[PDB]
Amino acid sequence: PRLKVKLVKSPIGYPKDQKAALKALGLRRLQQERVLEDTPAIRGNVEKVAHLVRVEVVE
Amino acid sequence: GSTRNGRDSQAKRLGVKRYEGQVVRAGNILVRQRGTRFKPGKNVGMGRDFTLFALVDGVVEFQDRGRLGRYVHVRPL
RNA sequence: GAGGGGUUGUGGCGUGCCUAUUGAAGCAUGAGCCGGCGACUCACGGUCGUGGGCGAGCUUAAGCCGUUGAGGCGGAGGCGUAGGGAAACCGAGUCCGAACAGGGCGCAGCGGCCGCAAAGUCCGCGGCCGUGGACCCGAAACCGGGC
RNA sequence: GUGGAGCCUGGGAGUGAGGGCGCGAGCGAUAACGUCCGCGUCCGAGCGCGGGAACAACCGAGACCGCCAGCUAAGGCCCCCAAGUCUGGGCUAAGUGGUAAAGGAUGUGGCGCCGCGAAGACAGCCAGGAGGUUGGCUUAGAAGCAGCCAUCCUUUAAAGAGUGCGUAAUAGCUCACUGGUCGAGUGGCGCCGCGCCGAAAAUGAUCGGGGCUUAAGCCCAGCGCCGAAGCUGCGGGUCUGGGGGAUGACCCCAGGCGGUAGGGGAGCGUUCCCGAUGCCGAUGAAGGCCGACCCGCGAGGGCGGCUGGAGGUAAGGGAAGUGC
RNA sequence: CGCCUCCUAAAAGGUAACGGAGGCGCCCAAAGGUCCCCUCAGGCGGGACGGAAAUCCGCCGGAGAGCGCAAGGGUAGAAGGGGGCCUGACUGCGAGGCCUGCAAGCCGAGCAGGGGCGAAAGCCGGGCCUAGUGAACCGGUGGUCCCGUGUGGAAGGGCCAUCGAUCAACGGAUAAAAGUUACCCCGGGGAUAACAGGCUGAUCUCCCCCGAGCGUCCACAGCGGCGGGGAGGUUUGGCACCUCGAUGUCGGCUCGUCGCAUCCUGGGGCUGAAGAAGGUCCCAAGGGUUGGGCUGUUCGCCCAUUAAAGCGGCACGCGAGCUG
RNA sequence: UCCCCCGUGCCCAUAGCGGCGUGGAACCACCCGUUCCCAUUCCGAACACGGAAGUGAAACGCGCCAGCGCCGAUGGUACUGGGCGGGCGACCGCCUGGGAGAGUAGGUCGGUGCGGGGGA
Ligand SMILES: CC(=O)[C@H]1O[C@@H](OC2=CCC(/C=C(\C)C(=O)N[C@@H]3[C@H](O)[C@@H](O)[C@H]4OCO[C@H]4[C@@H]3O)=CC2=O)[C@@H](O)[C@@H]1O
Ligand SMILES: NC(=[NH2+])NCCC[C@H](N)C(=O)O
Ligand SMILES: [Mg+2]
Ligand SMILES: [Mg+2]
Ligand SMILES: [Mg+2]
Ligand SMILES: [Mg+2]
Ligand SMILES: [Mg+2]
Ligand SMILES: [Mg+2]
Ligand SMILES: [Mg+2]
Ligand SMILES: [Mg+2]
Ligand SMILES: [Mg+2]
Ligand SMILES: [Mg+2]
Ligand SMILES: [Mg+2]
Ligand SMILES: [Mg+2]
Ligand SMILES: [Mg+2]
Ligand SMILES: [Mg+2]
Ligand SMILES: [Mg+2]
Ligand SMILES: [Mg+2]
Ligand SMILES: [Mg+2]
Ligand SMILES: [Mg+2]
Ligand SMILES: [Mg+2]
Ligand SMILES: [Mg+2]
Ligand SMILES: [Mg+2]
Ligand SMILES: [Mg+2]
Ligand SMILES: [Mg+2]
Ligand SMILES: [Mg+2]
Ligand SMILES: [Mg+2]
Ligand SMILES: [Mg+2]
Ligand SMILES: [Mg+2]
Ligand SMILES: [Mg+2]
Ligand SMILES: [Mg+2]
Ligand SMILES: [Mg+2]
Ligand SMILES: [Mg+2]
Ligand SMILES: [Mg+2]
Ligand SMILES: [Mg+2]
Ligand SMILES: [Mg+2]
Ligand SMILES: [Mg+2]
Ligand SMILES: [Mg+2]
Ligand SMILES: [Mg+2]
Ligand SMILES: [Mg+2]
Ligand SMILES: [Mg+2]
Ligand SMILES: [Mg+2]
Ligand SMILES: [Mg+2]
Ligand SMILES: [Mg+2]
Ligand SMILES: [Mg+2]
Ligand SMILES: [Mg+2]
Ligand SMILES: [Mg+2]
Ligand SMILES: [Mg+2]
Ligand SMILES: [Mg+2]
Ligand SMILES: [Mg+2]
Ligand SMILES: [Mg+2]
Ligand SMILES: [Mg+2]
Ligand SMILES: [Mg+2]
Ligand SMILES: [Mg+2]
Ligand SMILES: [Mg+2]
Ligand SMILES: [Mg+2]
Ligand SMILES: [Mg+2]
Ligand SMILES: [Mg+2]
Ligand SMILES: [Mg+2]
Ligand SMILES: [Mg+2]
Ligand SMILES: [Mg+2]
Ligand SMILES: [Mg+2]
Ligand SMILES: [Mg+2]
Ligand SMILES: [Mg+2]
Ligand SMILES: [Mg+2]
Ligand SMILES: [Mg+2]
Ligand SMILES: [Mg+2]
Ligand SMILES: [Mg+2]
Ligand SMILES: [Mg+2]
Ligand SMILES: [Mg+2]
Ligand SMILES: [Mg+2]
Ligand SMILES: [Mg+2]
Ligand SMILES: [Mg+2]
Ligand SMILES: [Mg+2]
Ligand SMILES: [Mg+2]
Ligand SMILES: [Mg+2]
Ligand SMILES: [Mg+2]
Ligand SMILES: [Mg+2]
Ligand SMILES: [Mg+2]
Ligand SMILES: [Mg+2]
Ligand SMILES: [Mg+2]
Ligand SMILES: [Mg+2]
Ligand SMILES: [Mg+2]
Ligand SMILES: [Mg+2]
Ligand SMILES: [Mg+2]
Ligand SMILES: [Mg+2]
Ligand SMILES: [Mg+2]
Ligand SMILES: [Mg+2]
Ligand SMILES: [Mg+2]
Ligand SMILES: [Mg+2]
Ligand SMILES: [Mg+2]
Ligand SMILES: [Mg+2]
Ligand SMILES: [Mg+2]
Ligand SMILES: [Mg+2]
Ligand SMILES: [Mg+2]
Ligand SMILES: [Mg+2]
Ligand SMILES: [Mg+2]
Ligand SMILES: [Mg+2]
Ligand SMILES: [Mg+2]
Ligand SMILES: [Mg+2]
Ligand SMILES: [Mg+2]
Ligand SMILES: [Mg+2]
Ligand SMILES: [Mg+2]
Ligand SMILES: [Mg+2]
Ligand SMILES: [Mg+2]
Ligand SMILES: [Mg+2]
Ligand SMILES: [Mg+2]
Ligand SMILES: [Mg+2]
Ligand SMILES: [Mg+2]
Ligand SMILES: [Mg+2]
Ligand SMILES: [Mg+2]
Ligand SMILES: [Mg+2]
Ligand SMILES: [Mg+2]
Ligand SMILES: [Mg+2]
Ligand SMILES: [Mg+2]
Ligand SMILES: [Mg+2]
Ligand SMILES: [Mg+2]
Ligand SMILES: [Mg+2]
Ligand SMILES: [Mg+2]
Ligand SMILES: [Mg+2]
Ligand SMILES: [Mg+2]
Ligand SMILES: [Mg+2]
Ligand SMILES: [Mg+2]
Ligand SMILES: [Mg+2]
Ligand SMILES: [Mg+2]
Ligand SMILES: [Mg+2]
Ligand SMILES: [Mg+2]
Ligand SMILES: [Mg+2]
Ligand SMILES: [Mg+2]
Ligand SMILES: [Mg+2]
Ligand SMILES: [Mg+2]
Ligand SMILES: [Mg+2]
Ligand SMILES: [Mg+2]
Ligand SMILES: [Mg+2]
Ligand SMILES: [Mg+2]
Ligand SMILES: [Mg+2]
Ligand SMILES: [Mg+2]
Ligand SMILES: [Mg+2]
Ligand SMILES: [Mg+2]
Ligand SMILES: [Mg+2]
Ligand SMILES: [Mg+2]
Ligand SMILES: [Mg+2]
Ligand SMILES: [Mg+2]
Ligand SMILES: [Mg+2]
Ligand SMILES: [Mg+2]
Ligand SMILES: [Mg+2]
Ligand SMILES: [Mg+2]
Ligand SMILES: [Mg+2]
Ligand SMILES: [Mg+2]
Ligand SMILES: [Mg+2]
Ligand SMILES: [Mg+2]
Ligand SMILES: [Mg+2]
Ligand SMILES: [Mg+2]
Ligand SMILES: [Mg+2]
Ligand SMILES: [Mg+2]
Ligand SMILES: [Mg+2]
Ligand SMILES: [Mg+2]
Ligand SMILES: [Mg+2]
Ligand SMILES: [Mg+2]
Ligand SMILES: [Mg+2]
Ligand SMILES: [Mg+2]
Ligand SMILES: [Mg+2]
Ligand SMILES: [Mg+2]
Ligand SMILES: [Mg+2]
Ligand SMILES: [Mg+2]
Ligand SMILES: [Mg+2]
Ligand SMILES: [Mg+2]
Ligand SMILES: [Mg+2]
Ligand SMILES: [Mg+2]
Ligand SMILES: [Mg+2]
Ligand SMILES: [Mg+2]
Ligand SMILES: [Mg+2]
Ligand SMILES: [Mg+2]
Ligand SMILES: [Mg+2]
Ligand SMILES: [Mg+2]
Ligand SMILES: [Mg+2]
Ligand SMILES: [Mg+2]
Ligand SMILES: [Mg+2]
Ligand SMILES: [Mg+2]
Ligand SMILES: [Mg+2]
Ligand SMILES: [Mg+2]
Ligand SMILES: [Mg+2]
Ligand SMILES: [Mg+2]
Ligand SMILES: [Mg+2]
Ligand SMILES: [Mg+2]
Ligand SMILES: [Mg+2]
Ligand SMILES: [Mg+2]
Ligand SMILES: [Mg+2]
Ligand SMILES: [Mg+2]
Ligand SMILES: [Mg+2]
Ligand SMILES: [Mg+2]
Ligand SMILES: [Mg+2]
Ligand SMILES: [Mg+2]
Ligand SMILES: [Mg+2]
Ligand SMILES: [Mg+2]
Ligand SMILES: [Mg+2]
Ligand SMILES: [Mg+2]
Ligand SMILES: [Mg+2]
Ligand SMILES: [Mg+2]
Ligand SMILES: [Mg+2]
Ligand SMILES: [Mg+2]
Ligand SMILES: [Mg+2]
Ligand SMILES: [Mg+2]
Ligand SMILES: [Mg+2]
Ligand SMILES: [Mg+2]
Ligand SMILES: [Mg+2]
Ligand SMILES: [Mg+2]
Ligand SMILES: [Mg+2]
Ligand SMILES: [Mg+2]
Ligand SMILES: [Mg+2]
Ligand SMILES: [Mg+2]
Ligand SMILES: [Mg+2]
Ligand SMILES: [Mg+2]
Ligand SMILES: [Mg+2]
Ligand SMILES: [Mg+2]
Ligand SMILES: [Mg+2]
Ligand SMILES: [Mg+2]
Ligand SMILES: [Mg+2]
Ligand SMILES: [Mg+2]
Ligand SMILES: [Mg+2]
Ligand SMILES: [Mg+2]
Ligand SMILES: [Mg+2]
Ligand SMILES: [Mg+2]
Ligand SMILES: [Mg+2]
Ligand SMILES: [Mg+2]
Ligand SMILES: [Mg+2]
Ligand SMILES: [Mg+2]
Ligand SMILES: [Mg+2]
Ligand SMILES: [Mg+2]
Ligand SMILES: [Mg+2]
Ligand SMILES: [Mg+2]
Ligand SMILES: [Mg+2]
Ligand SMILES: [Mg+2]
Ligand SMILES: [Mg+2]
Ligand SMILES: [Mg+2]
Ligand SMILES: [Mg+2]
Ligand SMILES: [Mg+2]
Ligand SMILES: [Mg+2]
Ligand SMILES: [Mg+2]
Ligand SMILES: [Mg+2]
Ligand SMILES: [Mg+2]
Ligand SMILES: [Mg+2]
Ligand SMILES: [Mg+2]
Ligand SMILES: [Mg+2]
Ligand SMILES: [Mg+2]
Ligand SMILES: [Mg+2]
Ligand SMILES: [Mg+2]
Ligand SMILES: [Mg+2]
Ligand SMILES: [Mg+2]
Ligand SMILES: [Mg+2]
Ligand SMILES: [Mg+2]
Ligand SMILES: [Mg+2]
Ligand SMILES: [Mg+2]
Ligand SMILES: [Mg+2]
Ligand SMILES: [Mg+2]
Ligand SMILES: [Mg+2]
Ligand SMILES: [Mg+2]
Ligand SMILES: [Mg+2]
Ligand SMILES: [Mg+2]
Ligand SMILES: [Mg+2]
Ligand SMILES: [Mg+2]
Ligand SMILES: [Mg+2]
Ligand SMILES: [Mg+2]
Ligand SMILES: [Mg+2]
Ligand SMILES: [Mg+2]
Ligand SMILES: [Mg+2]
Ligand SMILES: [Mg+2]
Ligand SMILES: [Mg+2]
Ligand SMILES: [Mg+2]
Ligand SMILES: [Mg+2]
Ligand SMILES: [Mg+2]
Ligand SMILES: [Mg+2]
Ligand SMILES: [Mg+2]
Ligand SMILES: [Mg+2]
Ligand SMILES: [Mg+2]
Ligand SMILES: [Mg+2]
Ligand SMILES: [Mg+2]
Ligand SMILES: [Mg+2]
Ligand SMILES: [Mg+2]
Ligand SMILES: [Mg+2]
Ligand SMILES: [Mg+2]
Ligand SMILES: [Mg+2]
Ligand SMILES: [Mg+2]
Ligand SMILES: [Mg+2]
Ligand SMILES: [Mg+2]
Ligand SMILES: [Mg+2]
Ligand SMILES: [Mg+2]
Ligand SMILES: [Mg+2]
Ligand SMILES: [Mg+2]
Ligand SMILES: [Mg+2]
Ligand SMILES: [Mg+2]
Ligand SMILES: [Mg+2]
Ligand SMILES: [Mg+2]
Ligand SMILES: [Mg+2]
Ligand SMILES: [Mg+2]
Ligand SMILES: [Mg+2]
Ligand SMILES: [Mg+2]
Ligand SMILES: [Mg+2]
Ligand SMILES: [Mg+2]
Ligand SMILES: [Mg+2]
Ligand SMILES: [Mg+2]
Ligand SMILES: [Mg+2]
Ligand SMILES: [Mg+2]
Ligand SMILES: [Mg+2]
Ligand SMILES: [Mg+2]
Ligand SMILES: [Mg+2]
Ligand SMILES: [Mg+2]
């Protein structure tokens, strides 16, 4: 069970800890997609930036 | 036109210094305080200015004993 | 001479340069234009870094001899090889102390004898620091001797 | 959680005038493009790009280079102006939209809530509306209706010693009030949406303009498209990492590459020295003037034609009066 | 102007303003160490002199008293009150920490020496705690006997301990220090005032809402208590945003031009409008809006007239147009 | 291992105040004395010693009672981390996660560890 996370809204203008969450997820470019294992710690950062991101449950 | 106020003293950096579960060494300060807001418990001494400090290496534990007060203990490792 | 050069009618877009500023196209500074001159260096010391030499050692200074764009000699001396203490002094310790206490400051190679790699030190190079005007230009002034 | 993350030692700094905005406070006047802190953010240094008419900091978005390719963001799709004169339901008539408040109003629409009414309402027309009472605090008037410490009867279908107008008083009109007349609604509340007034300032006006009314305005619900230097496709550069391969030989894959103060790296060119008793040079040195050519990311370097007429100087190193 | 307490301070710490409130520059030989004992303020009732409150008794009374002094925290299961013995208001040190730019400041178990109290467990390196303070340099005093300029001494130093700071501008320039400049000068700043502009609109000017009450009667002809909402940007200011490598200032003269909250003339409604003359409001910016005395004046007062002798904006319009 | 009592802890008022009732064999207390140890800023009240005639009156223990005190949901709301909108403002909303305080229903006249003496 995994999470497909697409960065869809720019973090410019958002607090630095939300920029850091993106770094924890490996999201560094707009429209970039990452597939991460679905653990509570990863899901914590995905939710932190949910207003920036598009999520999809996979495999 | 002039102010009779304008004075204040330096802040004193009071408060708890080691929270429950933290590993301390003997002599470590655990609480800076005015009076006995916390009381020394097992393996914790108290100095002339109410400072709580650990008497042994170990782990900090807090305990709220109601009307008996709040206590800081150090459980040896 | 299926390409390119010159010119520019129309359409799109478009707030000089530098300086100083929170912020300048800015109605803030400087510049008419062109050419030439024009501002981070050098000596000595220091501190790191670095390229080499040698290594419990490293290195010479003034000179002297040679050379006439030839190098050599010269160990006086300097840094390092021990620290601690105000000092007497003791010394891998020493200082405080009554202490054999406690504490401060100190004390310590890889390989199959030879290698290597290294204290440290010498020289070159580079950054930055100290002393000099020390990146360059600029006062109002102060002082001396004359007119 | 492998990130231009973190920690340790040391070399070099610059900065120590901030500013807007959002939130939380203090000061100020629940003033200031005001001021002083806190958390955040952007500009500073992103006055690079789209939107906002124009505009550092509002919205969108972090610009390595190239393309007459594609998708989007905010914002837009009647014409200026790229894309809908797109679809369905409603509202507004004020050009409201396209700057303002207490407050005022039979503007409009949607709701609730009372009543009063075919035991005949409301409106209109039609009568009546009356004795005690020129009444009591009362006199200088106070006679229902100048203020009070009053509302009581009587004749009735009905009638408050009185709603408003009038008198100095009186009267008078006329209300609540009851009867007839027609023949179905009528009066009063409260709430919501959108509008109206309240709304005067100095050069010429204007929502950015034109112009727009079952909108090209506003509210609700949709489908499509346009739209940036964001994202994608293709090609290239450089650095970093990983592979090749063993080592800078070149290749392949991946990622980073806005930037002021400032740190670091790699280069270009100028003058001079070694190279050089050499070598290029009158079949033409240096310098000058051209070039649409070649190499180089670039600073530059070649090459060619003309000028010029005697100097110039390689690979590799060295030193500075070195680039306006 | 250093230091302490509380708040501001956005529930860790820290956090500013010429923000809101208070305190310190001491003190105590016990007000210190230890051992033992004791428990408040206040209310009610009772008691000679004796009272709101002196001292006594009883009942209720968890902490509102007390703790030398500000404030806060803490506190009777004592840190409060009383007594006995005492000097730990130790010497030599100090694991480990708090805080922190530095330097300071703070807490501190434990070991040794020699003690105090206690039967003992133990406690004691001043004070319930947080303010009661001052780095160096220079010098004094006691001790130490470490240095002693050929040598022995001595002079003079070092070391240990302690002293002399309103160095209070309290991280403290010298051992030693006030004014004036319109006779002024230089370097700078629109980092910062005076002018004008800007933002703001408290103040200013104007317009409204409410309807007490006035107006013989009658809230609204004309007025409008106490309160409430706005507009304008001509006043005085707030702020300090362009301009200090210069944006010339009051008043006058000259020349206009604009706004309309209209002074006159034109058109109106209401009137407590008989007429005539007025008052008040509405529409209206086309034109017009005098001459003189005083004063630098703007303004204003005055004289004589007038249909009227309007008020504001234009860098308080206009000095590369004049005056001064 | 059950009930009563006596010591001593823990939870820290659901354990408290008040009213009533109960217990003396045992234990505890008051009690009986003040010679002795010790003691009163006076007092054998207290502290202390030696006792054992009495009483559970005081105190203590154990019950019952909800007048006070104490505890107190569920539901709803305020507020809010994060995300969004609106207003010229004072300020007002929406989404997601969190979520009081007051008050209401109700609860409570304690629960429990260890040792000792007694009882069955
Ligand atoms: C002039 C200069 O050289 C420079 O200064 C700048 O200009 C000005 C500076 C100051 C100024 C006015 C001042 C100081 C004043 O106090 N003015 C008041 C009052 O406000 C004024 O209206 C008059 O009122 C009656 O008397 C006056 C009264 O003293 C006017 C200026 O124009 C700059 O642009 C110029 O280059
Ligand atoms: N989920 C929250 N933290 N909400 C905060 C509420 C604040 C916001 N101004 C509102 O009234 O809606
Ligand atoms: Mg998406
Ligand atoms: Mg964004
Ligand atoms: Mg981004
Ligand atoms: Mg944004
Ligand atoms: Mg955040
Ligand atoms: Mg955080
Ligand atoms: Mg991106
Ligand atoms: Mg004062
Ligand atoms: Mg203050
Ligand atoms: Mg002060
Ligand atoms: Mg402080
Ligand atoms: Mg402070
Ligand atoms: Mg403080
Ligand atoms: Mg704390
Ligand atoms: Mg102590
Ligand atoms: Mg103390
Ligand atoms: Mg726990
Ligand atoms: Mg414990
Ligand atoms: Mg052509
Ligand atoms: Mg062309
Ligand atoms: Mg062409
Ligand atoms: Mg075009
Ligand atoms: Mg331009
Ligand atoms: Mg511009
Ligand atoms: Mg240039
Ligand atoms: Mg310049
Ligand atoms: Mg400047
Ligand atoms: Mg400036
Ligand atoms: Mg400025
Ligand atoms: Mg220009
Ligand atoms: Mg210009
Ligand atoms: Mg200027
Ligand atoms: Mg200029
Ligand atoms: Mg300047
Ligand atoms: Mg010139
Ligand atoms: Mg020219
Ligand atoms: Mg030149
Ligand atoms: Mg240099
Ligand atoms: Mg030089
Ligand atoms: Mg040099
Ligand atoms: Mg050097
Ligand atoms: Mg050097
Ligand atoms: Mg070197
Ligand atoms: Mg050598
Ligand atoms: Mg040698
Ligand atoms: Mg030497
Ligand atoms: Mg020495
Ligand atoms: Mg000694
Ligand atoms: Mg030692
Ligand atoms: Mg050591
Ligand atoms: Mg070697
Ligand atoms: Mg070496
Ligand atoms: Mg340096
Ligand atoms: Mg010099
Ligand atoms: Mg000089
Ligand atoms: Mg120089
Ligand atoms: Mg220099
Ligand atoms: Mg002179
Ligand atoms: Mg002099
Ligand atoms: Mg002089
Ligand atoms: Mg002379
Ligand atoms: Mg970085
Ligand atoms: Mg970094
Ligand atoms: Mg790394
Ligand atoms: Mg560094
Ligand atoms: Mg460097
Ligand atoms: Mg450097
Ligand atoms: Mg600086
Ligand atoms: Mg500096
Ligand atoms: Mg400074
Ligand atoms: Mg500053
Ligand atoms: Mg500033
Ligand atoms: Mg600031
Ligand atoms: Mg500031
Ligand atoms: Mg703000
Ligand atoms: Mg802010
Ligand atoms: Mg908001
Ligand atoms: Mg707010
Ligand atoms: Mg705020
Ligand atoms: Mg505040
Ligand atoms: Mg106001
Ligand atoms: Mg500001
Ligand atoms: Mg503001
Ligand atoms: Mg403000
Ligand atoms: Mg900021
Ligand atoms: Mg700057
Ligand atoms: Mg930006
Ligand atoms: Mg930035
Ligand atoms: Mg921008
Ligand atoms: Mg810009
Ligand atoms: Mg542009
Ligand atoms: Mg823009
Ligand atoms: Mg734009
Ligand atoms: Mg545009
Ligand atoms: Mg802009
Ligand atoms: Mg701006
Ligand atoms: Mg980029
Ligand atoms: Mg498309
Ligand atoms: Mg869109
Ligand atoms: Mg448009
Ligand atoms: Mg079109
Ligand atoms: Mg649409
Ligand atoms: Mg349509
Ligand atoms: Mg209208
Ligand atoms: Mg309009
Ligand atoms: Mg309009
Ligand atoms: Mg309204
Ligand atoms: Mg209204
Ligand atoms: Mg209406
Ligand atoms: Mg309506
Ligand atoms: Mg009457
Ligand atoms: Mg009548
Ligand atoms: Mg209107
Ligand atoms: Mg429609
Ligand atoms: Mg596009
Ligand atoms: Mg594009
Ligand atoms: Mg890109
Ligand atoms: Mg590519
Ligand atoms: Mg890189
Ligand atoms: Mg590549
Ligand atoms: Mg690449
Ligand atoms: Mg770059
Ligand atoms: Mg580098
Ligand atoms: Mg070169
Ligand atoms: Mg050059
Ligand atoms: Mg030469
Ligand atoms: Mg030669
Ligand atoms: Mg030659
Ligand atoms: Mg030849
Ligand atoms: Mg020839
Ligand atoms: Mg030729
Ligand atoms: Mg040449
Ligand atoms: Mg040459
Ligand atoms: Mg060329
Ligand atoms: Mg020729
Ligand atoms: Mg040539
Ligand atoms: Mg020659
Ligand atoms: Mg050469
Ligand atoms: Mg060579
Ligand atoms: Mg030069
Ligand atoms: Mg200080
Ligand atoms: Mg605070
Ligand atoms: Mg606070
Ligand atoms: Mg705090
Ligand atoms: Mg801290
Ligand atoms: Mg002050
Ligand atoms: Mg004071
Ligand atoms: Mg005493
Ligand atoms: Mg009493
Ligand atoms: Mg009494
Ligand atoms: Mg008496
Ligand atoms: Mg009494
Ligand atoms: Mg108290
Ligand atoms: Mg006091
Ligand atoms: Mg005592
Ligand atoms: Mg005592
Ligand atoms: Mg004794
Ligand atoms: Mg330490
Ligand atoms: Mg420190
Ligand atoms: Mg201090
Ligand atoms: Mg001892
Ligand atoms: Mg002893
Ligand atoms: Mg002892
Ligand atoms: Mg003894
Ligand atoms: Mg002892
Ligand atoms: Mg001790
Ligand atoms: Mg005390
Ligand atoms: Mg005491
Ligand atoms: Mg004290
Ligand atoms: Mg001190
Ligand atoms: Mg000195
Ligand atoms: Mg001395
Ligand atoms: Mg001596
Ligand atoms: Mg001697
Ligand atoms: Mg001698
Ligand atoms: Mg001698
Ligand atoms: Mg002798
Ligand atoms: Mg001797
Ligand atoms: Mg002697
Ligand atoms: Mg002596
Ligand atoms: Mg001393
Ligand atoms: Mg002195
Ligand atoms: Mg003072
Ligand atoms: Mg000072
Ligand atoms: Mg001073
Ligand atoms: Mg001080
Ligand atoms: Mg000094
Ligand atoms: Mg001094
Ligand atoms: Mg002196
Ligand atoms: Mg002085
Ligand atoms: Mg002085
Ligand atoms: Mg002077
Ligand atoms: Mg004068
Ligand atoms: Mg004078
Ligand atoms: Mg004079
Ligand atoms: Mg003169
Ligand atoms: Mg003169
Ligand atoms: Mg004179
Ligand atoms: Mg002068
Ligand atoms: Mg000057
Ligand atoms: Mg100067
Ligand atoms: Mg100057
Ligand atoms: Mg200014
Ligand atoms: Mg300043
Ligand atoms: Mg100013
Ligand atoms: Mg000024
Ligand atoms: Mg001014
Ligand atoms: Mg002013
Ligand atoms: Mg003025
Ligand atoms: Mg002006
Ligand atoms: Mg001004
Ligand atoms: Mg201006
Ligand atoms: Mg202006
Ligand atoms: Mg304004
Ligand atoms: Mg206003
Ligand atoms: Mg206004
Ligand atoms: Mg006002
Ligand atoms: Mg108005
Ligand atoms: Mg009215
Ligand atoms: Mg009246
Ligand atoms: Mg009337
Ligand atoms: Mg009235
Ligand atoms: Mg009126
Ligand atoms: Mg009034
Ligand atoms: Mg107002
Ligand atoms: Mg007003
Ligand atoms: Mg104005
Ligand atoms: Mg003005
Ligand atoms: Mg002002
Ligand atoms: Mg003003
Ligand atoms: Mg001001
Ligand atoms: Mg200013
Ligand atoms: Mg300024
Ligand atoms: Mg400012
Ligand atoms: Mg100026
Ligand atoms: Mg100039
Ligand atoms: Mg100028
Ligand atoms: Mg000038
Ligand atoms: Mg004036
Ligand atoms: Mg005019
Ligand atoms: Mg008008
Ligand atoms: Mg008229
Ligand atoms: Mg008329
Ligand atoms: Mg008439
Ligand atoms: Mg009349
Ligand atoms: Mg008449
Ligand atoms: Mg009239
Ligand atoms: Mg009217
Ligand atoms: Mg009218
Ligand atoms: Mg007119
Ligand atoms: Mg006109
Ligand atoms: Mg006129
Ligand atoms: Mg005259
Ligand atoms: Mg005359
Ligand atoms: Mg005159
Ligand atoms: Mg006059
Ligand atoms: Mg005159
Ligand atoms: Mg006057
Ligand atoms: Mg007068
Ligand atoms: Mg006349
Ligand atoms: Mg007239
Ligand atoms: Mg006149
Ligand atoms: Mg004017
Ligand atoms: Mg003015
Ligand atoms: Mg003025
Ligand atoms: Mg003027
Ligand atoms: Mg004027
Ligand atoms: Mg003028
Ligand atoms: Mg002039
Ligand atoms: Mg003038
Ligand atoms: Mg002029
Ligand atoms: Mg001029
Ligand atoms: Mg002119
Ligand atoms: Mg001019
Ligand atoms: Mg004149
Ligand atoms: Mg004059
Ligand atoms: Mg028991
Ligand atoms: Mg237990
Ligand atoms: Mg009871
Ligand atoms: Mg009984
Ligand atoms: Mg009982
Ligand atoms: Mg018995
Ligand atoms: Mg019995
Ligand atoms: Mg006796
Ligand atoms: Mg006996
Ligand atoms: Mg007795
Ligand atoms: Mg007893
Ligand atoms: Mg007995
Ligand atoms: Mg009993
Ligand atoms: Mg008892
Ligand atoms: Mg019950
Ligand atoms: Mg609770
Ligand atoms: Mg509750
Ligand atoms: Mg709840
Ligand atoms: Mg929020
Ligand atoms: Mg809300
Ligand atoms: Mg919520
Ligand atoms: Mg929730
Ligand atoms: Mg709450
Ligand atoms: Mg609750
Ligand atoms: Mg109970
Ligand atoms: Mg129990
Ligand atoms: Mg037990
Ligand atoms: Mg038991
Ligand atoms: Mg038993």
CA distance A55 to A34: 10
DSSP E strand stretches across B1-77: 15-16, 23-24, 29-32, 38-40, 44-46, 52-54, 58-64, 70-75
B69 in contact with nucleic chain F (CB within 7 A): no
**What gap in Å lies between CA A57 and CA B36, rounded to an integer?**
55
Segments making up each domain of chain A, as ranges? 1-59
Experimentally determined by? X-ray
Contact B42, B73 (CB under 8 A): yes
CATH number for the domain that contains residue B61: 2.40.50.100
Q: What is the resolution of this structure in A?
A: 2.3
Question: Domain for residue B43, yes or no?
Answer: yes
Q: Is the CB of B64 under 7 A from strand E?
A: no
Whether B32 is covered by a domain: the verdict is yes
- Choose among B66, B64, B37: nearest CA to B52: B37
**H or E element at residue A46:** helix A40-48
As a rounded value in angstroms, the CA-to-C1' distance for B10 and D57 is 37
CA B1 to C1' E298 (Å) is 35
3-state helix, strand, coil in chain B (%, to 5): 5, 40, 55
Q: Is residue B53 part of a domain?
A: yes
* CA–CA gap between residue B62 and residue B76 (Å, rounded): 14
Q: Name the residue among B36, B66, B75, B76 with its Cα closest to residue B52.
A: B36
What architecture is domain A1-59? 2-Layer Sandwich (3.30)
Q: Is the CB of A32 under 7 A from strand F?
A: no
Give the number of C-alpha atoms closer than 13 A to the C-alpha of residue A30, restricted to the C-beta side.
6
Asked if B29 contacts B60 with a C-beta cutoff of 8 angstroms, the reply is no
Residue B60 structural domain: 13-77
